[PDB]
Each structure stands twice: as structure tokens, then as C-alpha cells.
Amino acid sequence: ELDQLRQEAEQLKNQIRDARKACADATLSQITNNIDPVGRIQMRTRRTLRGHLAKIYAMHWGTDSRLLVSASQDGKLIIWDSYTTNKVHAIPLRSSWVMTCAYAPSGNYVACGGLDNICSIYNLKTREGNVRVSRELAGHTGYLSCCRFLDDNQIVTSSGDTTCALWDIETGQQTTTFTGHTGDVMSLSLAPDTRLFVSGACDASAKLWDVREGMCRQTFTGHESDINAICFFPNGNAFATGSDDATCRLFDLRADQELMTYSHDNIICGITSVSFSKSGRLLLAGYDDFNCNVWDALKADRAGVLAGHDNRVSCLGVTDDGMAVATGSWDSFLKIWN
Amino acid sequence: VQLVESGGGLVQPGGSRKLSCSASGFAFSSFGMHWVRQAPEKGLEWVAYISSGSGTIYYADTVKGRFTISRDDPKNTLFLQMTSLRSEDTAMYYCVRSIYYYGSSPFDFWGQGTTLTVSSSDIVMTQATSSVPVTPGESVSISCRSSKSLLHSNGNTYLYWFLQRPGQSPQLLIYRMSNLASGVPDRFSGSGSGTAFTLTISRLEAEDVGVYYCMQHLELTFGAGTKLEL
Amino acid sequence: ASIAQARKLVEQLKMEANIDRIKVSKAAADLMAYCEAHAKEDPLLTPVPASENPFRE
Amino acid sequence: DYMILSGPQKTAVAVLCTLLGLLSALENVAVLYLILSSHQLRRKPSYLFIGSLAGADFLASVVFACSFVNFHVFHGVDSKAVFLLKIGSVTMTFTASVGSLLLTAIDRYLCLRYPPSYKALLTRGRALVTLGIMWVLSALVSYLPLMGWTCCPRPCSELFPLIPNDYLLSWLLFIAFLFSGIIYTYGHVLWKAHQHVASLSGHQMRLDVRLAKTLGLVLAVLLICWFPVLALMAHSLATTLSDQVKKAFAFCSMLCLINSMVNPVIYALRSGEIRSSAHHCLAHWKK
Amino acid sequence: CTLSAEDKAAVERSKMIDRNLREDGEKAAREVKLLLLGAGESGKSTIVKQMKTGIVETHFTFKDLHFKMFDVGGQRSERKKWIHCFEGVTAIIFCVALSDYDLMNRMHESMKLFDSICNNKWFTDTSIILFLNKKDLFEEKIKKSPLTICYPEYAGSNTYEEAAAYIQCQFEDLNKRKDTKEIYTHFTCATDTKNVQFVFDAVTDVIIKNNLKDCGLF
Ligand SMILES: O=C1C[C@H](c2nc(-c3ccc(F)c4c[nH]nc34)no2)CCCN1c1ccc(F)cc1
């Protein structure tokens, strides 16, 4: 019966919560109470990349750590050289409503997606000296929220219908489908090992997925609102989530429980982007109050403030070698900080 | 992709003629264009350059004010005013494309060329050996030397190693050192050590056999024509 | 019928609850060890001298 | 001896000018702050004209007060060079103000002639180059006697201490052209607004009233202040002025300053976002 | 200039790209965008029929002006997470069927939708063009059935001219922004042809008022 099944589900949830409480002994703040703080950190704007004429919704650093890609609502996808602010490529999209972008690890391909429920893949290094639409992938029934390359022939895509997918670029087919979320999925993060990946949705719950077997491993429920961003700790044994209730949360998949909460009494707006740095000592968070913040990964105390944007900060990224931080905002300016 | 040459032939000194380079199979409006000359008794020699959008035009210091070059993007063609010709202009003419951005590989594609029979502070490079035996299938290391150091302040070793096959048009072997792009086989590797240059091909092939031409692009003079026999 | 959805939820819960978890005191010191092991290669944390910074404006 | 303005009333005007002068100055400065420290309000190209008008008005007030008080209250030596310099400066700034008024009139005409494409016709660069060329032209026209003249063979005016008589006529024609342009532009603006309201009324009148209640006030405050001085100067051009009304001329000059105190109220304070920025600034400055 | 041979060519290419981007944006910023947000299937598919994947897009021209209409009714997802992408749209077109009064009730749900979309924080200064369609059915339905089924507190008569006005004023007072935004209402049906003229006049009024506010006159 439905009543018996919901009763036993509640009993299982109670047992899981009791085991979670039992397997917790000491807060990480207790261990790291007496650790030398990082001190105040001052970062300055080295470059400013003009050229967009609308809001900026995504950006991704290349593996060479010199080239980057940005996507705007003016139907434009632009590739920049960060050392000297020259425009390498400018690609016009079929639909303006784009809210995600990715840059291939090899460097030959780019991907984009948005409110058209289609993921478009463009080939960069081709003859004829232009860019062409390599492949269009369709099959989702909701707007596409994130995409992340696995290799030259596999990508992972999360949609607004509550389902993620692993594709095959050579022939467009849903190789694997991941289901289990109640609300629409907002973001996904891909592990460096490329064996597992994490997903965050609007049901205030995050999940871990195995790419090969296609079955969910764990589930984390700590927030009480929508989750807007997620990323992996460089080690691969932790991750961080940002939500609309103006708090960040650092979790782990070994102990399967909460580790840290980052909040303040003077912050009310939500978080739109989260990223780590090399060695995992700094959290970078973009907020809706025109401002960006830097947090210590072991202390909840703030360390630095990045101001200079005249609107909400939407996208934030850190290079592969950890030498610069790029931010975008709803005013058409990308800023590089060092 | 193909470039077809039209014009040329028998010309009296100081004549006037049209030279045309027709392109088909690629985006012509995004490529800069070069004209290259090869004398029957000599090697290659640069003539003229224009950029995309007719921005800048460059001529050789020995032909400055003698020729001129134009580009017609809507008609998709390249034109040269063959005028004020001396007695030493009889040669073979080649049309070359080149695109410049970060990570690009210019000088990749060459045309067939046209024959011309006429009636009757620069950097100079050198080649240590003017004739070397070659066995394809092994690893070959190639290097050229010049009158100046080719390294710029940006820190890249910067020199082009190029090949001419006997009987047909030349083709590109490697662009500036330490960088390998698409369009060429993966066997190539480049390296530089200030004034030491190195091109390494692990699997030498009859494709990489012929006459080369170490070339500079800093400030475009070709190296001495050295045919490495088999 | 909602019996299928409830059964699926029960199955997911029961295969999620079967995994064992380790103590936090040892699962948290790994993060500190990783942070202190790679603290010397953080251009954003330590102030790198301007001689070798590719961004100079 | 050219000045025959005497009496006990002089001390009165001796303060009246300053009792007004810096006042206008300071409020003009206020505008020059609000339009600039906002760092997002000046992004609109239409505020550059108002800022130039405010700056020109501030310069006019500051330069005119001292120049007109030293001559009549302190009786300075007033050598030829310094006198010509101050006369050129006051004429330049008073012409730049009218140029700014005409330019903002043209802007408001473009706001209605091409509604959809207005965001593409007038940008930062065009506004800045137009402001620069207007300032250069005004400076060139104003500093004409600095090039050289004597009015020895041709008898020059008596109201001004050795200013050529032809320059008065030329300056009057210049301002007549400027005023005619302003009147034509604010006539066409109202005509277009009325036509649009009438055309929309066919399917099923507040816009016309809202526009008129401001434009008529602007025209009146400009005309009732600038007409008497030009009229009296034109009368003196033809007539030797056998009456004493020349002594009243300086008093009519006070009218030229009366405009300066109302320009920020009529023009700058009318904009709502200016008031919002003022409220934010006063809230911030409580510390 | 201390630039190599390739660096100048790269700079020239970047300049050409900048020129092309500016030229494209200048043309893009001269067109009119309308967000079509008709509730349900209340004649939304008809107005596009005589005025001529997740998001459907329609282009048309009238009096040398380009209109782009976005229909987003096929999303069926969380409306509060992709609605901020439509800031800066010129106008919101809303559609309501007058014959659904007796059919909870459809009209009450339409009222909830209108209230939710009119008072959103992203649409505090965006004009709404409201269409009341299926009038030809509505007049005969009124002369056959009373309006008191949907409206309990209605003391008026049972004629068309009064019921239509009562419904219009019942819809038009749901806005809390009586000064920043305005609501335009029209009565149309299948046989009508002059809808495009009404849209053009309304959008020209909106554009003129926005321009007047921008230049500081208001
Ligand atoms: O006459 C006026 C009106 C107005 C004005 N100035 C005077 C005036 C009169 C007598 C003086 F001792 C003055 C010293 N400074 N100003 C003086 N009366 O009216 C200042 C600029 C415009 N203008 C003017 C200035 C120079 C010209 F050549 C023509 C007109």
C-alpha cells in the first residue's frame, strides 16, 4: 500500500539520520581552531575585456590557461586571449537565449546550450578558416542548464526536467540517462578522475552519480532552498554548494555529512557561482549584491572582497595553474583579477 | 580548397599585364595573401603581401614602387599589376595564403604558379651543410642559423622550415618552433634554446624529402636552396 | 498509480543507506594535509613577485 | 569719465550681485557634483549638454560678478588687456549657455522625431564632438576684439568703454539666429506631440499638457529675461540715447544674472533621477 | 611599437572583429521585442495567425518596423528561474478569453496569473497589452446566460456593454504600480484585422514615453 510504503520510507529516513548523527564525532572547526589565518588578501584588476553588448551568462577557462570563452544574451560566443585582450573568434548562435558554455579539454571543440532544449557543438580547428556547427544534440524536454566535456566524444548534460544525460557526440544518442531528482537540475560538477560527478537541483538536495554504471551513490540534504552552483574540491573527496539563502556549504562523500557552513549576518542575497583555488584554501563566491567574496576553506571568516562590477555577478572561474581569476557580470564586462 | 593562377607568359621588359589568383574552397575574406617568386637559377623570393580587409600592403625593398597588388573579396580573387619589369624577372610565381591569430599556422597552402619569360638592414640566414645524405624512416633533426637571434620578447622560438618537392609546388613542413597545430602530421616537434633551433621528425618519410628553405618572419627572405639527396 | 514512485523511492533509499561512513576526525584531516602539502604552489595565496606574472597591465 | 553711475543706491547693488552670485554658483556646483559622482547617471549622453550648461553658468556668474563690481564699486585701473580679457570671457560664457540651450533643444526634438532609432543616432562620441565644436566656435566669435581694432575712424559705442560698433551688430545677429533656432525646435516638438496624441486618440491628451507646462515655462523664463537687454542694445545702436536710460542699462544687466539662478531649477531639478541621486547623496553624507 | 610581425596582424584581426560586433549590435538594438504570455489556449494561437523546441519565435514587419514575438508557453518548468532573461523587453502581451467566465473557474486562475506576472520584481516598469478575445461568442453567451455565476457581487444588468466594462475594470485594477506602468486594453475577435495597428500605436507610445524619461524631461 502507499501508506505502508511511505511509513517505511520515513522509517528508513529516520534510520539514515540516526546513523549520520552517530558517525559524527567532532566538528572540523574544532580541529582547525588554532591554525594560522591567511590574512587579508588584496587582488587587483589586470585586464578588462570589452566587447559584449548584453548580459554575460557563462565563461570557461581553457586548459592552456591563456584562452577563454564567454557567452552573452546578444547571441554571441567570444573567445579571448587573456594575456593580450585580442578577440580570436566570434561565433553567432542560432538562438540568443543561451545560459551555458564549455571549452573542450583538447581545445578543438566548444559547446553551448540554453532555452531551446538543444546542445550545440562547434568545431574550432578546421580548414576553411572558420567555425562550423559540428553537431546538434536534442532529446531533452526542459531548458538546458549545464554541460561539461568528458573527452572529444562524450559530454554530460543536465536539463530543467529533472534529468541528466551522458551522450555520444559521434552519433547523437542518449548513451546514459540519470534520473532521481524531484526538482529541475541547476548545475553539475565533473570530478578530475572523470569517474563520478555531482549534481545540484532545486529540491535542496545534491546527488553523486557514477558515469559508467549509471546509478546514484549518495544523496546530501543540507540546504532549505534552491542550489545554484557546485564544484569539486581539488583532492576529489569534497565539494561545495551555494544556495539562494545566502549560505555556502562544504560537504564530503567519505563521511557523507556536513563539514562547513559559510554565512554572515550582512549578506541576504543568494550565490550565483562557486569555485575553488589550487590546494583548496580559498573559496570564491559571486553574490547578487554587485560583489564577490573570498572565504577561507578551513575558517568561516572572510578574507577578501572583489568589487568593481555594476550589476549581479553571474559567472566566475579560476585558471588551471591558479594564476588569475576571471569574473563576469550582468554588465557586459569581463574582469581578470590577480 | 584550391588556388588557380592565370596570366604570365612571354613579356617584353617594362610591359603591363594582369596576374590573377582565384581561390575556391575556403573563406577568402579572412586570409592574408602573399606573392612569392622562384627564379630558375635561384631559390624562393618574396614579392608582396596584403592583409584581410585591405588593411596594410607591403612590398620588397628591391621592388618597392614597381608592382602593386589588389584584392577583390566579393569577386573572390587576387590581382597583381605586372608592370615595369626588368630583364631578371623571368621566374615562377606562387600565390600563398596565411592567417594570423594565436596558435595559427600561416603559409600552409600554396598554389601551382605561373611561368614568366622576359626578353633580354635585412636578416640573412645561412646553412652549415649544403648537401646531406638522407635515409627516410629514421629520425631527422633540422636546424638553420641566421644573422640575428629570432626570439622575440614574448619568448617564442620563431622560424619556418619548409620543403619543395621536385616536379610540383612546395608545401609546408613546420611553422615557428615549440608549437604544433592541426593540418600537419603529428611526427613533427619543435624546440628552441635561445640561438639553438631544432625540428625533430621521428618518422622521416619521402614526403619530407626534397629541397628545403629555412625562412624568417620577424621583420621575408628565403634561405639557400639546399636539396638533401637520398 | 503512485505505487511505482513510492517503490522506486524506497529502493533508492535502501540502496543508499547500505554504504558505510568513516569518522569525521580522520576524514577531515585529509583536507588539512592536502592544503598544507600544496601551499607552496598557490600564486593567489602567496604574493608572487611581478617578474614572473604574465599579467602586468 | 565714461561711467556716470552715481548715487546712494550703488552700495545696494554692490551687495545685490554677490548676494545672488555665489548662490547661483554654489547650486550650479551642486549639479556638477550630482551629474558626475553618480558614476551611472552620466552614461546617458543627454546629460552632457546639461552639465555643460551648468558649468558655463557657473563660469559666467563667477567671472561676471567680479568684473561688474570692480568697474562700478571699486573703480579699478582697468587696463586694455585685462578689460578685453574679461569682456571676452563673459561674452564667451554667455554665448556658450545659449549654445547649450539650443543643443538640448535639438536633443529633445530628436527624442520625438525618431522614437525607435533615437538610441542609435545620439551617442557619447557625437555629443562630445558637438559640444567641443560649439565651445570652439563660441570662443572664436567672442574673442574677436582681441585680434585687434580701434574704433578710431568709425565711432564706436558709448555704453561700452571702447568696444567696436559693428561687433554689437554681429553679436546681436548671432544671438537672433540662436534664439530663432530654439523657438523653431520647441515649436516643432509640441507640434509632433500633438499630432501623435491626436493620431492615437482615433482608436480610443495628458502628454501634450505635460509637455506644454514645461516648454512654455522654459520659453517664458528665457524670453522675459533676455529680451530687455537685447532690445535696449538695439535701441542704442541706432539712437544716441539722449535720455538717462543708459544708467538703467546696468540694472538691466542684473537680469542677465537672474536667469543663471533658475536654470538648475527649471532644467536640472526637473529630472526625477537627479532628485533620487540627491536623496541618496544626502542620506550618505549624514556621517 | 615593440610588436612582432604576427602581433600586428592579430591586432588588426581583433579590430575587424570589434567593428563587426559593433555593426551587428547597432542593428540589433533597433528592433522591437514583445513577450507573448497568453494564459492557456485562450486564443493565443490565433492572434499570431492573423498577425503574420521550448521557445517559439515569430518575426514580422509593419511600417518599416521589425517586431520579434517570443512565445514561451511550451516550457512547463519553474517559471521563476528563467523569467529574469526577459528584462528589457518592450511589452508583455496578455491574452484572455471572455467566454470562459462560467467554466476552479478559469477566469479566477487567469486573474491569479495576471496578478503574479504584473507585480513581479523584474516587470516594475514594463507595459502590458491586454487582449480580450472570443467576444462574438461572449455576447450571445451573455444574452443566453447571466454573469452572476462567476461574479457573486455584481449589481449591474445583463447586457454586453456593462458586463464587458465590468470585466475590464476588474482586470485593470490588479496592478500595484499605477504610475510607473500602464495597461492597454482591446476587444478583438477572429474577424478583426486592425490588431496590428493597435499593437503599433501602443508600442510607439511606450517607446516615446521611455525616450522622454531617458532625456531627463520627465
Ligand atoms: O552686454 C552683454 C550683456 C551683459 C552685459 N554686460 C554689461 C557690462 C556693461 C558695462 C561694463 F563695464 C561691463 C563689464 N562687464 N560687463 C559689463 N552689461 O550687460 C554680459 C555678456 C553679454 N553682453 C555682451 C558682452 C559683450 C559684447 F560685445 C556684447 C554683449
Q: Is E88 annotated as a binding residue?
A: no
Q: Does E215 touch chain A (CB under 8 A)?
A: no
Does the C-beta of D47 come closer than 6 Å to ligand 1? no
DSSP-assigned letters across all residues of E173-218: T--S-TTT--EEEEE--TT--THHHHHHHHHHHHHHHHHHHHTT--
B152 with E16: Cβ contact below 8 A: no
Quote the cell numbers at residue D198. 491626436
- Distance between CA atoms of residues A178 and B173, nearest Å: 47
Resolution in angstrom units: 3.1
Residue of chain B nearest A66, judged by CA positions: B102
DSSP state letter for A41: -
Q: Are A313 and A327 in contact (CB under 8 A)?
A: yes
Does the C-beta of D17 come closer than 6 Å to ligand 1? no
Cell 586694455 sits on residue: D80
Q: Does E156 touch chain A (CB under 8 A)?
A: no
Residue of chain E nearest D204, judged by CA positions: E186
Note down the domain range covering E79.
3-218
**Best C23, C46, C53, C55 residue to mutate vs chain A (most A CBs within 10 Å):** C55
Q: Which residues of D touch E214 (CB under 8 A)?
A: 44, 46, 111
Does the C-beta of D83 come closer than 6 Å to ligand 1? no
Chain E residues in contact with chain B using a Cβ-Cβ cutoff of 8 Å = 2, 4-10, 12-13, 16
Nearest CA to B163 out of B21, B43, B39 is that of: B43
- Distance between CA atoms of residues E216 and D107, nearest Å: 11
Portion 101-160 of A in contact with E at CB < 8 A: 115-118, 142-143, 160
Q: How far does CA E193 lie from the centroid of its chain?
A: 18
Q: Among E4, E5, E13, select the one facing B101 at the smallest CB separation.
A: E13
DSSP state letter for A115: T
Does the C-beta of D24 come closer than 6 Å to ligand 1? no
E77 with A95: Cβ contact below 8 A: no
- Distance between CA atoms of residues E98 and E134, nearest Å: 6
Q: Is E45 annotated as a binding residue?
A: yes
Cα of D87 vs centre of ligand 1, distance in Å, is: 7
- Distance between CA atoms of residues D198 and D208, nearest Å: 10
Tell me, yes or no, whether chains E and B touch by having 3 or more C-beta pairs under 8 A: yes
Residue minimizing CA distance to atom 19 of ligand 1 = D253
| Angular region, B151: left φ>0, alpha ψ -120 to 50, beta rest | beta
Cα of D256 vs centre of ligand 1, distance in Å, is: 9
The pairing of strands A109-114 and A185-190 is unpaired
Three-state DSSP at A264 gives coil
- Distance between CA atoms of residues A140 and A146, nearest Å: 12
- Contacts of residue E176, defined as CB under 8 A and 6 or more positions apart, other chains included, come to E119
Three-state DSSP at A38 gives coil
Q: How far does CA B164 lie from the centroid of its chain?
A: 10
- Distance between CA atoms of residues B45 and B93, nearest Å: 10
Q: How was this structure determined?
A: cryo-EM
Q: Let me know if domain B2-118 sits in CATH 2.40.30.10.
A: no
DSSP-assigned letters across all residues of chain D: ------STHHHHHHHHHHHHHHHHHHHHHHHHHHHHHTSSSTTSTHHHHHHHHHHHHHHHHHHHHHHHHIIIII-----HHHHHHHHHHHHHHHHHHHHHHHHHHHHHHHHHHSTTTHHHHS-HHHHHHHHHHHHHHHHHHHT-TTT----TTTT--TTTTT--HHHHHHHHHHHHHHHHHHHHHHHHHHHHHHHHHHHHTTT--HHHHHHHHHHHHHHHHHHHHHHHHHHHHHHHHHS---SSTHHHHHHHHHHHHHTTTTHIIIIITTSHHHHHHHHHHHHHTT-
Q: Are B47 and B39 in contact (CB under 8 A)?
A: no
C35 with A8: Cβ contact below 8 A: no
The shortest C-alpha distance from A1 to chain C (Å) reads 7
Nearest ligand 1 atom, CA D249:
18
B100 with E13: Cβ contact below 8 A: yes
Q: What is the domain count for chain E?
A: 1
Q: Is E144 annotated as a binding residue?
A: no
- Distance between CA atoms of residues A312 and A272, nearest Å: 9
- Distance between CA atoms of residues B73 and B53, nearest Å: 8
Quote the cell numbers at residue D127. 555629443
Tell me, yes or no, whether chains B and A touch by having 3 or more C-beta pairs under 8 A: yes
Q: Which residues pair with B73 in a beta bridge?
A: none
Q: Which residues of E touch A53 (CB under 8 A)?
A: 21, 25, 28-29
Nearest CA to A178 out of A205, A202, A214 is that of: A214
Q: Does A202 touch chain E (CB under 8 A)?
A: yes
- Distance between CA atoms of residues D177 and D169, nearest Å: 12
Count Cα neighbours of D102 within 13 Å in the Cβ-side half-sphere. Answer: 21
A23 with C22: Cβ contact below 8 A: yes
Q: Which residues of E touch B55 (CB under 8 A)?
A: 12
Q: Does E217 touch chain D (CB under 8 A)?
A: yes
> In this structure, what CATH number is given to the domain that contains residue E178?
3.40.50.300
- Contacts of residue B11, defined as CB under 8 A and 6 or more positions apart, other chains included, come to B17, B82, B85, B89, B116, B117, B118, B119
Rg (CA), chain C: 24
Rg (CA), chain B: 18
Tell me, yes or no, whether chains D and E touch by having 3 or more C-beta pairs under 8 A: yes
Does the C-beta of D229 come closer than 6 Å to ligand 1? yes
DSSP-assigned letters across all residues of chain E: ----HHHHHHHHHHHHHHHHHHHHHHHHTTSEEEEE---TTSSHHHHHHHT----EEEEEESSS-EEEEEE-TT--S-TTSSGGGGTT-SEEEEEEEGGGS----HHHHHHHHHHHHHT-TT-SS-EEEEEEE-HHHHHHHHHHS-STTT-SS--S-S-HHHHHHHHHHHHHT--S-TTT--EEEEE--TT--THHHHHHHHHHHHHHHHHHHHTT--
Nearest CA to D217 out of D271, D266, D274 is that of: D266
Which domains does chain D show, CATH number per domain?
9-282 (1.20.1070.10)
Which domains does chain C show, CATH number per domain?
3-55 (4.10.260.10)
- Distance between CA atoms of residues A326 and A333, nearest Å: 11
Q: Are A333 and A48 in contact (CB under 8 A)?
A: yes
- Distance between CA atoms of residues A152 and A106, nearest Å: 7
Q: Ligand 1 pocket test: which of D79, D173, D256 has the largest number of ligand atoms within 8 Å of its C-beta? A: D256
- Distance between CA atoms of residues D39 and A310, nearest Å: 10
Three-state DSSP at A336 gives strand
Q: Is E134 annotated as a binding residue?
A: yes
- Contacts of residue E122, defined as CB under 8 A and 6 or more positions apart, other chains included, come to E83, E84, E86, E87
A23 with C41: Cβ contact below 8 A: no
Q: Is E15 annotated as a binding residue?
A: no
Q: Ligand 1 pocket test: which of D74, D86, D87, D230 has the largest number of ligand atoms within 8 Å of its C-beta? A: D87
- Contacts of residue E25, defined as CB under 8 A and 6 or more positions apart, other chains included, come to A53, A74
A226 with E18: Cβ contact below 8 A: no
Q: Among C39, C48, C57, select the one facing A47 at the smallest CB separation.
A: C57
Q: Is E75 annotated as a binding residue?
A: yes
CA dihedral sign, ordered E2, E6, E7, E12: positive
Partners of chain D (3+ Cβ pairs below 8 A): E
Q: Which residues of B touch A126 (CB under 8 A)?
A: 182
Q: Is E116 annotated as a binding residue?
A: no
Does the C-beta of D65 come closer than 6 Å to ligand 1? no
Residue minimizing CA distance to atom 29 of ligand 1 = D168
DSSP-assigned letters across all residues of chain B: -EEEEE--EEE-TT-EEEEEEEEESS-GGG-EEEEEEE-TTS-EEEEEEE-TTS--EEE-TTTTTT--EEEETTTTEEEEEEES--TT--EEEEEEEE--STT---S--B---EEEEE------EE-S-S-----TTS-EEE--EESS----TT-----BEEEE-TTS--EEEE-STT---TTS-TTEEEEE-SS-EEEEESS--GGG-SEE--B-----PBPP--B---
The residue extents of the domains of chain A are 1-337
A41 with C45: Cβ contact below 8 A: yes
Q: Let me know if domain B131-228 sits in CATH 2.60.40.10.
A: yes
Q: Is E43 annotated as a binding residue?
A: yes
Q: Let me know if domain A1-337 sits in CATH 2.130.10.10.
A: yes
A161 with E21: Cβ contact below 8 A: no
- Contacts of residue B197, defined as CB under 8 A and 6 or more positions apart, other chains included, come to B143, B144, B145, B157, B159, B177, B191
Q: Which residues of D touch E26 (CB under 8 A)?
A: 120
Portion 5-34 of A in contact with C at CB < 8 A: 5-6, 8-9, 12-13, 15-16, 19-20, 23-28, 31-32
